[PDB]
Ligand SMILES: Cc1nc2ccc3ccc(CNc4ccc5c(c4)CN([C@@H](CCC(=O)O)C(=O)O)C5=O)cc3c2c(=O)[nH]1
Ligand SMILES: Cc1nc2ccc3ccc(CNc4ccc5c(c4)CN([C@@H](CCC(=O)O)C(=O)O)C5=O)cc3c2c(=O)[nH]1
């Protein structure tokens with residue numbers, strides 16, 4: 184997509200060479216923001232085929248408050264398998280924090296239910312936030328939230344969302360995070376009777392692994408095509424009742440998929 | 448400063464009229480980002496006069512883990528007065544979150560010292576973050592954190608910082624948050640032996656209160672002056688050891704102040 188490709192080039196052009204944890208080396212920039220008008224179409228990359236299916240399951244796994252890759256294996260999403268323990272557990276990652284943040288004093292806050300209720304009762308609120316960055320439980324997580332903090336906003340009947348992404352694998356994960364967050368805005372907007380506004384993506388350490396270069400070069404030379412359109416086939420009774428069959432993508436005609444190694 | 452004056456102009460030009468908790472009415476945009484290379488000068492607004500002293504004291508206060516206004520009062524910081532209880536207590540706002548976020552298992556993590564330790568030992572880390580957003584104690588806070596989450600980054604021996612501000616009164620508060628975080632950067636960079644890099648500001652609901660329009664327009668008719676220079680006259684044994692007297696601002700010749708009413 185235009186915004187995506189320009190960020191990729193921007194990493195190539197100004198990225199600083201860093202030695203990372205994995206000892207693979209990255210090309211990195213710090214602080215970037217991009218905006219997606221969701222009224223223009225679903226922000227699914229067309230320069231490399233992406234599977235809306237793995238996107239939708241990882242999203243519904245989070246809203247359910249699940250931290251076990253079982254549901255994810257059974258639906259062929261496997262990215263998370265190298266991070267789980269022998270039981271399939273990740274610790275209190277995303278899903279746990281969104282649905283049950285543990286208070287220092289034995290209770291749990293359900294941040295999606297709060298957000299829903301604020302969108303329905305107090306849309307002007309400047310505090311419609313979801314944080315996965317639970318300082319207190321970071322050491323128990325297999326991986327510290329990458330997509331860590333997000334805020335909603337309504338202006339004239341439209342729901343916008345801004346995400347803060349502390350660390351971003353530009354080639355592999357970015358396509359995934361943009362579609363997932365676009366999808367949630369779509370689902371939050373239907374449950375709440377709002378129109379879709381913009382998806383604002385803000386990044387911290389935004390990088391390209393030194394081993395995604397040929398594949399990045401390959402991608403930068405394809406012509407982005409018209410964005411697809413999302414269809415939500417049924418309006419479930421709650422934000423929690425969605426299912427895969429409920430979503431469809433019209434006019435998605437990507438360039439063939441591009442394979443690349445995951446850095447572990 | 449150019450970035451700040453361009454942000455003001457942007458809310459005026461693309462902001463939408465929003466109702467707010469205060470009943471005042473704002474003009475606001477959602478999602479913005481600006482960068483200040485700290486090597487160009489200290490980002491203290493010059494198109495209206497700001498007092499570096501009251502910016503220092505508020506930060507020294509955060510760095511001490513204090514949430515009582517007494518220290519602020521002994522030094523003439525009255526902005527927080529109205530938020531404070533009868534005892535001068537604000538609840539676990541910023542400073543407590545910063546120095547002692549309470550975990551579920553009876554621990555308290557000091558995020559300032561952790562970031563300092565990460566800066567010295569693993570500067571390439573993608574998770575050098577301080578969050579003030581403790582979902583678990585928000586209900587105990589006089590005001591939910593506005594400057595909520597920040598991340599450090601090192602590249603080429605320079606320390607950069609990105610702050611995510613969920614709610615921003617552009618006229619009154621922003622000059623203050625910009626200067627405060629650029630001082631924190633200078634202090635971290637001095638302790639860790641780094642040079643100052645960039646301060647990146649990212650905003651959520653960025654607004655002008657309805658009643659700041661004339662002041663805003665008056666400010667905007669002014670031409671920015673050269674940026675002041677910051678001099679630290681000592682190297683304390685810790686980030687916790689700066690005194691108001693260790694800092695000098697040179698070359699600050701601002702236009703006259705403009706007052707505007709605070710919305711409560
Ligand atoms: C280095 C690295 N590590 C990660 C570790 C865990 C992640 C979990 C989720 C996401 C983003 N969300 C999804 C959601 C689904 C898929 C993928 C990512 C990747 N993916 C692959 C590989 C996954 C699979 O083969 O099942 C593909 O191209 O088909 C998926 O089905 C990214 C990472 C990254 C990531 O992007 N990069
Ligand atoms: C509507 C609104 N409400 C607030 C509530 C609490 C705040 C706390 C801190 C800051 C940001 N930081 C400082 C730090 C010190 C000072 C000021 C702001 C403003 N200030 C005033 C004096 C007002 C006062 O001292 O009571 C000035 O006009 O110079 C200070 O000494 C802003 C707010 C806002 C804010 O900017 N706007």
Ligand SMILES: Nc1nc2c(ncn2[C@H]2C[C@H](O)[C@@H](COP(=O)(O)O)O2)c(=O)[nH]1
Pocket residue numbers: 204326327329330350351352353355356357360573574
């Ligand atoms: N874009 C994207 N990158 C991810 C995601 N999860 C992990 N990564 C990448 C960021 C880093 O490249 C690496 C995680 O390492 P670290 O930043 O050190 O926590 O994996 C994700 O959901 N999206």
Ligand SMILES: Nc1nc2c(ncn2[C@H]2C[C@H](O)[C@@H](COP(=O)(O)O)O2)c(=O)[nH]1
Pocket residue numbers: 309310468591593594614615616617619620621624
């Ligand atoms: N710029 C700036 N604005 C602040 C700060 N603290 C409070 N405000 C403003 C944001 C809003 O106008 C109001 C806080 O209100 P609310 O967003 O509803 O929680 O105060 C601060 O440090 N900086």
